[PDB]
Amino acid sequence: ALRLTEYSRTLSGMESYCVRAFADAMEVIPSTLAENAGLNPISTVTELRNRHAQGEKTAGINVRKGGISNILEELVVQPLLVSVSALTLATETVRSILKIDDVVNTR
Amino acid sequence: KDQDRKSRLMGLEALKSHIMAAKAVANTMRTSLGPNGLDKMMVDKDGDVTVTNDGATILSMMDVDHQIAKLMVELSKSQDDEIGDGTTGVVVLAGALLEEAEQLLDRGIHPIRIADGYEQAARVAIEHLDKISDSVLVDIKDTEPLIQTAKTTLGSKVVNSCHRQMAEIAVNAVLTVADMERRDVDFELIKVEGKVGGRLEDTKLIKGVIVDKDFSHPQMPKKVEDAKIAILTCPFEPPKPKTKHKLDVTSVEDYKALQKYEKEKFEEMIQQIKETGANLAICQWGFDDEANHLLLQNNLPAVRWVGGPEIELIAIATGGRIVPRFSELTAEKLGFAGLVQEISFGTTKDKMLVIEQCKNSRAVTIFIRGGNKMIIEEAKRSLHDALCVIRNLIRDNRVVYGGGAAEISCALAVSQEADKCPTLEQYAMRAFADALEVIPMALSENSGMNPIQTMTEVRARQVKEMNPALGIDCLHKGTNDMKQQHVIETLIGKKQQISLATQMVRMILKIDDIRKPGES
Amino acid sequence: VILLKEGTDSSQGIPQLVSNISACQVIAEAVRTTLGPRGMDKLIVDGRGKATISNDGATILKLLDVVHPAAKTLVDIAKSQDAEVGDGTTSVTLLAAEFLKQVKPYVEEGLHPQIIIRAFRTATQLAVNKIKEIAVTVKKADKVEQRKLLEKCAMTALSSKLISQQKAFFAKMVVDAVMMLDDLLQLKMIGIKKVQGGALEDSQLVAGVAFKKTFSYAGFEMQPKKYHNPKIALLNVELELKAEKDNAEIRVHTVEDYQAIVDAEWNILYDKLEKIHHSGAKVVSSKLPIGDVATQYFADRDMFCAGRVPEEDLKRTMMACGGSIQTSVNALSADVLGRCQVFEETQIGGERYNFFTGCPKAKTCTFILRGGAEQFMEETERSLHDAIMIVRRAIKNDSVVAGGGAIEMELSKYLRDYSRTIPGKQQLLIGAYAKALEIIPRQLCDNAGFDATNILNKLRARHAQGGTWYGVDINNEDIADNFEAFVWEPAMVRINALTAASEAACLIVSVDETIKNPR
């Protein structure tokens, strides 16, 4: 969500608001994990955007200790295919829904 | 007392109701922003009809019961003493800050915390305006570039036909009443009048005070070169009251007796003019046929039926005093001026009194001719902000290119400074960036073009093509970069648009309740 | 047919006491968000249509005028709070209604109201003894000049404001304005005026009494401003040539009498100007406007006159120069004339301003506000007024305690441990008495936009480590020491706050039946 905002500034036309909306919708995943962990959803996401700007991907949310800590040191890791297939399959479904003008019942 | 039927609005819904009432005023004026902005129809309580796109005039004519809506109107009185042109742009900017604040209230952010974000982002935008600002008259005082700037402001009004001639008059008028080095220009020393007939190209600059009154007699001298002015509240004749004389004449015995007493008063006060050395006599009332008969023999022109407030304006401009009676006359109370003439208008019997100093003075009055009273009234407002543009250039000659180039360049810096604030006010800084984009967006919408495609296209040009800010052409000119189009607004005006809009949003968010009793 | 009440509305028992508790929470709800310097404001409109905007709890309660009988009780307690102290009306109203909320479920359980009164009387007596032990008198401490401590207390209250950058300069002006007073300190003495334009550093501190001087009329290039020992006259007379008050209308058929009538109308005005010259009054301050003709008279007589002066500025002048306000010019004499050492007309701001200097009877001064707009000055006007209150109360009472909910938490912890040592029904009531004292530090976090739960929980655990001065910081969000941050309040003010809150709470509980006589 942080890097797509910078790419939205370099583009032109309608792609500025459309890519930015795609970036802001990526913050719902960390906002949900912070809510179930007993923290402030709005304040936690704000601190992570700064730690990811100055630092690296290491910053994140640790649900076991209930606070922001190093994800690699807490032994939390996921393969790359899960995150890549999550964006690819979800995009194809969202694009398919936007292309539907009307439903027609046949017999 | 009167607790029953008392209107109360409280809670989170109170803030959303205040924003909705504020957006009703902002959405109304955003269509009139810019030179292509649509007009508004005004129906007076007495049945009069007038049409103007001026934002300051609209807010004065709008009658709104809601309390927060009344606060938006009170802002116009503060800005008109500075800008007087982009007053609509502040109301639109104030409505954009509140509209984006509605999305933040759903996230659970406290209103005071939102108001702190706008204040923090406002100083960043004001600081960015100082870097990109360029000067004109710096270190060298010149009237050549100053006249060209005023020609653009008058282009948005109905005076755009004669716009070139009225620019040189406003320049020489301000420089006469005050020096540019003094950097102090009072609007009370500048008056604007007008009369139906003629054209806007007939506007002239007379240094002094001018009011429309005729001479006591048409054969009086029309040109007085020396400066002698007698300003009295009483005419020269036997003393008469302020309403009705009602002389009592029983028969011819009282006629011949009182006429001799009046005859002594006829030659006494007329010859008294030459005793004090005075020439022109300004009296509040008129003269009889015998009084004007003695003035023609002695060559003593005078003005009759001078109004009440006109007496004070003549004594201040000419340097004289108000003399209640001829017994207090002296040489010090005489007013000064270079020339006194009577200039009529076509075949009209008005014959406005003309007082010319034949030199510089501390007060001037601009007169406007035109074929319609409503056009002249709009021509008066056309010079009002024009004087402010010249006054702002005298105070600070640094300027920032307008046409939306200023508001778009600021949001680029504010959006970058947002990631440097690890705190909840970061959202308020991002919403402050999208609010600045509304003013240049309303300019393209009023021009019959796609708003979004025009906004995002200019963003890419300022980041990639060139660092200097580029504007949007609402007049359908050749291209962008209004620097070549010579559309420029002062830097002082840009700092006030952000400062005054921040004050209004901060006051509306901190008010959580509005109370008032109802009719019992 | 035969009815006892016949339209008489009366109720008693438990429901009558519960109905009064819900009515007290409505009164505390209005002033609830106004607690604290950063608290939100309110907007109240009267029948005239004008809106009053301020966070002052004393002003809001006066405009409400609630018809409920139990609500009028808490309103009357706020009036007694002004005479004894003069502030804390919001704290007393909000805290007293909090006790009724805690004991509300105990009333529905069958607990008798008299036992509840026994708890609030005993617990309040112990809280007063605990405040006197914690209160420490600071005077010569660390051999610091008292002027330095007064400036540090002023910068803290003015921090995180519009003047927060210039607060270092304004702290000296607030302390100096208090030092110019006499041994008897009063807040109504020092006036504050606002002047548009100029930066914040342009604010001037005047030792005398200054006013806006809205007089726009003629008479310039005359009336020398410098006077060594002028006679200051206070007159409400209108010196205008043609005025709405004093005129002369006489209808005669004689032409020669018209010259006298016009002169007689000017004679009355000339007489009023002569009676001022007869007493030898150099400075003329008029409430009503003064005509241009009257200005030329005093101009040739080497005397100055200024009209359109507000009545409040004349009353502050009466207590300054040492004279008195005289309505007419006939009774004007040396008894009502004042004296000042230096009188000068200043052009600061571009407007013409007048002020006095070195008046023998003057206990008052005037401060000048300089800012970009009016809203910057109006909010700073009260912001500086709160700084004057801190400096004034610090001089009068030198024994203080840590503010910002710091003393409220220690009285909550001390009484929580003592309540366990009293077997009986007094345990649950005193335990609820300590919890109600925590509403003050909680409202400071909500009015500041912070998180009340995280701050209060970490603050409560911090008092378990022994620090008694720790409290909530309004600027930064964190637990800080209010004693080292120099946030102080007099001990007698906090004692009177708990006494008035406990008295108002016991009175509502003691009310059983509400009897209303139809008439």
Cα A40–Cα B101–Cα B416 angle in degrees, nearest 5: 75
User: Which candidate, A66, A59, A45, places its Cα nearest to that of A1?
Assistant: A45
Token pair for C513: 């039946």
| Chain A nearest-CA residue for B421 | A50
A50 touches chain B (CB under 8 A): yes
Helix/strand/coil for B104: helix
Examine the domain organization and report whether C249 and C303 are in the same domain: yes
B217 and B340 belong to one structural domain = yes
Phi/psi for B214 (5° steps) reads -95, 175
Q: Are residues B227 and B354 in the same domain?
A: yes
Q: Are residues B149 and B285 in the same domain?
A: no
On whether the CB atoms of residues B181 and B335 are closer than 8 A, the answer is no
- B174 in Cβ contact with B391 (< 8 Å): yes
Contacts of C186 (CB under 8 A, 6+ apart): C363
Last residue within a domain, chosen from B397, B423, B446? B397
- Looking at B397, B416, B445, the residue that finishes a domain is B397
* Neighbors of chain B by Cβ distance (3+ pairs < 8 Å): A, C
Backbone phi and psi for residue C263, each to the nearest 5 degrees, phi listed first: -75, -35
Give the span between the Cα atoms of C323 and C232, in whole angstroms: 8
At C513, give phi and psi (nearest 5°). Answer: -110, 140
Cα separation of B207 and B358, whole Å?
8
Q: B402 and B379 in one domain? A: no
Q: Does residue B149 contact residue B389 with C-beta atoms inside 8 Å?
A: yes
Work out whether strand B280-283 and strand B302-303 pair parallel, antiparallel, or are unpaired: parallel
Farthest CA pair distance, chain C: 104
Say if residue C195 is in the same domain as residue C339: no
Find the residue in A nearest to B422 (Cα): A47
Q: Are residues C375 and C256 in the same domain?
A: yes
- Domain containing C182 — which CATH number? 3.30.260.10
Cα(C307)–Cα(C219) distance, rounded to whole angstroms? Answer: 12
CA dist., res. C396 & res. B469, Å (int): 60
Q: How, if at all, do strands B40-43 and B49-52 pair?
A: antiparallel
Using CA atoms, how far apart are residues B177 and B207, in angstroms rounded to an integer?
9
Is there a single domain that holds both residue B436 and residue B447? yes
H/E element holding C42? strand C41-45
Q: Do B457 and A12 touch (CB under 8 A)?
A: yes
CA C9, chain centre distance (Å): 40
User: Is there a single domain that holds both residue B313 and residue B344?
Assistant: yes
CA distances from C101 to B420, B452, C29, C324, C437 (A): 44, 55, 12, 53, 12
- With CA atoms as reference, the chain A residue closest to B452 would be A14
User: What's the first-to-final CA gap in chain A, in angstroms?
Assistant: 46
Contact present, C51 and C121 (Cβ < 8 Å): no
Round the CA-based radius of gyration of chain A to a whole number and report it: 18
List C-alpha distances in Å: A1 to A57, A69, A98, B319.
Answer: 12, 20, 22, 72
Backbone angle region of B341, left / alpha / beta, with phi > 0 → left and psi within -120 to 50 → alpha: beta
Q: Which residues of B touch A13 (CB under 8 A)?
A: 453, 456-457
> Determined by which method?
cryo-EM
Q: Which subunits sit against A, judged by 3+ Cβ pairs under 8 A?
A: B
E strand or H helix at C194 = strand C191-196
Q: Are residues B386 and B264 in the same domain?
A: no
Q: Are C311 and C327 in contact (CB under 8 A)?
A: no
Question: Computed from CA positions of residues C328, C329, C333, C338, in that sequence, does the dihedral angle turn out positive or negative?
Answer: positive
Report the residue of chain B nearest C47, measured CA to CA. B517
Half-sphere exposure of C142 (CA within 13 A, CB side): 5
Any CB–CB contact under 8 A between C478 and chain B? no
CA distances from C209 to B165, C189, C357, C361 (A): 51, 10, 8, 12
Annotated binding site of B: 34, 85-88, 156, 403, 473, 489, 494
C-alpha distance from residue C134 to each of B81, C137, C513 (Å): 56, 10, 41
**C275 and C345 inside one domain:** yes
Q: Are residues C267 and C366 in the same domain?
A: yes
- Whether residues C295 and C173 fall in one domain: no
Resolution in A: 3.8
**SS3 (DSSP) at B282:** strand
Nearest CA in chain B to C62: B1
Is residue B349 domain-shared with residue B427, that is, in the same domain?
Answer: no
Q: Are strands C136-137 and C399-402 parallel, antiparallel or unpaired?
A: antiparallel
- Please state, in angstroms and rounded to a whole number, the distance separating the CA atoms of residues B208 and B227: 13
Q: How far apart are CA B32 and CA B441, in angstroms?
A: 13
Same domain, C389 and C360: yes
Least Cα separation, residue B412 to chain A (angstroms): 9
Domain interval for residue C324: 210-393
**All residues at 6 or more sequence positions from C371 whose CB lies less than 8 Å from its CB, including other chains:** C194, C196, C198, C200, C377, C380
- What is the total residue count of chain C? 519
Q: Are B444 and B472 in contact (CB under 8 A)?
A: yes
Beta-bridge mates of residue C53: C43
Question: Quick check: C59 contacting B, CB < 8 Å?
Answer: no
Cβ contacts (< 8 Å) between B511 and chain C: which residues?
40-43, 53
Q: Are the CB atoms for C391 and C175 separated by under 8 Å?
A: yes
Instruction: Give residue for tokens 């004689």.
Output: C254
Q: What phi, psi does B205 have (nearest 5°)?
A: -110, 110
Q: What is the largest CA-CA distance in chain B?
A: 104
Look at C46 and B517 and tell me if their CB atoms are within 8 Å: yes
Residue B140 touches partner A, C-beta closer than 8 Å:
no
Closest CA to C325 of C312, C342, C344: C312
Same domain, B390 and B482: no
Between strands B204-206 and B399-401, the pairing is unpaired
Say yes or no: B252 and B340 in one domain.
yes
- C279 and C297 co-located in one domain: yes
The answer to whether the beta carbons of residues C52 and C44 sit under 8 Å apart is yes
Cβ of residue B362 closer than 8 Å to a chain C Cβ: no
Kindly determine whether residue A16 and residue B456, on different chains, have CB atoms separated by under 8 Å. Answer: yes
Of residues B489, B468, B328, the one with CA closest to residue B402: B489
- The verdict on B516 touching C (C-beta cutoff 8 Å) is yes
**Dihedral sign from CA coordinates of C354, C360, C361, C366:** positive
CA C139 to the chain's CA centroid = 26
Please compute Rg for chain B using Cα positions.
Answer: 30
Could you tell me the CATH number of the domain that includes residue C259?
A: 3.50.7.10
Q: Based on the fold, state whether residues B246 and B340 are members of the same structural domain.
A: yes
CA distance linking residue B271 with residue C188, whole number of Å: 62
Domains of chain B: total:
3
Q: Which residue shows structure tokens 């479904």?
A: A93
Tally of helices (H runs) and strands (E runs) in chain C? 17, 18
Question: Which of B:424-453 have CB within 8 Å of A?
Answer: 424, 426-427, 452-453
Q: From CA C384, how far away is CA B295, in angstroms rounded?
A: 67
**Surface-to-core class of residue A75, CB atoms within 10 Å of its CB (0-12 exposed, 13-18 middle, 19+ buried):** exposed
**B-proximal residues of A, 1-30, CB under 8 Å:** 9-17
**Residue B80 contacts residue B404 (beta carbons within 8 Å):** no
| Closest C-alpha to C138, from C499, C493, C487, C496 | C487
Catalytic positions of C are 56, 89-90, 386
Judging contacts by C-beta atoms under 8 Å, the chain B residues touching residue C379 are: none
C352 and C243: one domain? yes
Q: Which of B361, B389, B407 is the last residue of a domain?
A: B361
How far, in Å, CA of C133 to CA of C381, rounded? 36
Contact residues on chain A for B113, CB-CB shorter than 8 A: none
Query: A43 and B419: CB-CB below 8 Å?
Result: no
Which of B240, B258, B517 is opposite residue C47, by nearest beta carbon?
Answer: B517
Owning domain of residue B160:
137-207+362-397
Q: Which amino acid, one-letter code, is at A100? A: I
Active site residues of B: 54, 87-88, 385
Does B516 contact C40 at a Cβ distance shorter than 8 Å?
Answer: no
C259 and C387 belong to one structural domain: yes
Report the distance separating Cα C493 and Cα C392, nearest Å: 13
Same domain, C367 and C384: yes
Contact C407, C400 (CB under 8 A): no
Yes or no: say if C449 and C479 are a contact pair by the CB < 8 Å rule.
no
B62/C contact by beta carbon, under 8 A: no
- Give the C-alpha separation, B345 to B193, whole Å: 14
Distance of CA C496 to the CA centre of its chain: 18
Rounded distance between C-alpha atoms, residue B137 and residue B134, angstroms: 10
Task: Say if CB C282 and CB C334 are below 8 A apart.
Answer: no
- Measured from the Cβ of residue C187, the count of other Cβ atoms closer than 10 Å reads 13
Counts of helices then strands in chain A (DSSP H, E): 5, 2
Residue of chain B whose Cα is closest to the Cα of C241: B324
Looking at the complex, report in whole angstroms how far the Cα of residue A57 sits from the nearest Cα belonging to chain B: 17
The overall longest dimension of chain A from CA atoms, in Å, is 60
Q: Do A46 and B422 touch (CB under 8 A)?
A: yes
B11 and B130: one domain? yes
- The torsion of the CA quartet C355, C360, C363, C366, rounded to 10 degrees, works out to 10
Q: Does C239 lie in the same domain as C183? A: no
Of C241, C354, C346, C237, the residue nearest C295 (C-alpha)? C241
Instruction: Name the residue among C115, C44, C88 with its Cα closest to residue C499.
Output: C88
With H, G, I as helix, E, B as strand and everything else as coil, classify residue C396. Answer: helix
**Which has the closest alpha carbon to C178: C200, C158, C150?**
C150
Residue with tokens 């982009």: B86
**Is B460 in contact with A11 (Cβ distance < 8 A)?**
yes
Tell me how far apart the alpha carbons of residues B311 and B349 are, in angstroms, rounded to a whole number: 21
